[PDB]
Design a protein around this ligand. Sequence first.
Ligand SMILES: NC(=S)Nc1ccccc1OC(F)(F)F
Length: 185
Amino acid sequence: HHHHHHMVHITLDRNTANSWLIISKDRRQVRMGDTHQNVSDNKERFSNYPMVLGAQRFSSGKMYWEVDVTQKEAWDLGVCRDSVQRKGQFSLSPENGFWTIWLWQDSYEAGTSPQTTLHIQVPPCQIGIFVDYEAGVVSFYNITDHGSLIYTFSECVFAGPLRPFFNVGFNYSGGNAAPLKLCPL
Ligand SMILES: NC(=S)Nc1ccccc1OC(F)(F)F
């Protein structure tokens, strides 16, 4: 791909974070803490899952960013509507306002309903995310494998402003403590 030149500087929005997340000073890294992180509750926080949004809102144009997933066992990445549900149980689907991929139990899947199996030969350590608002496209790239395509959502019906979306995953196994990191341009 030649999407790198639409690079945007993403930062994480603390106010949206699940109360167990720890976001770095520079707002570019996030990990699962081993307890509640001593913050007040608010209507923006994701309650049920270790999720957080980017601060940036996109309603036009082309945007690109990269995320480091090194030595994680589980995570979700992509974009979502600004108005997605925060409280309770929900599935990651375009019907619910999410355009995402994930790693879970040694398989990669796109968050369609029902989910779609991904075919990745080189497990990625960094993922590129490209959004073309006007075209209705969200694409994912394997930066570890020379930028190879992972998945494209097309004919997207965004129906609102978009925010970068992250899930660091639970750490029941003790093998998923590593952070998500926004990579430098
Ligand atoms: N709120 C729920 S249902 N679970 C949850 C979410 C975020 C951090 C911790 C959580 O409970 C757990 F520790 F049991 F997983």
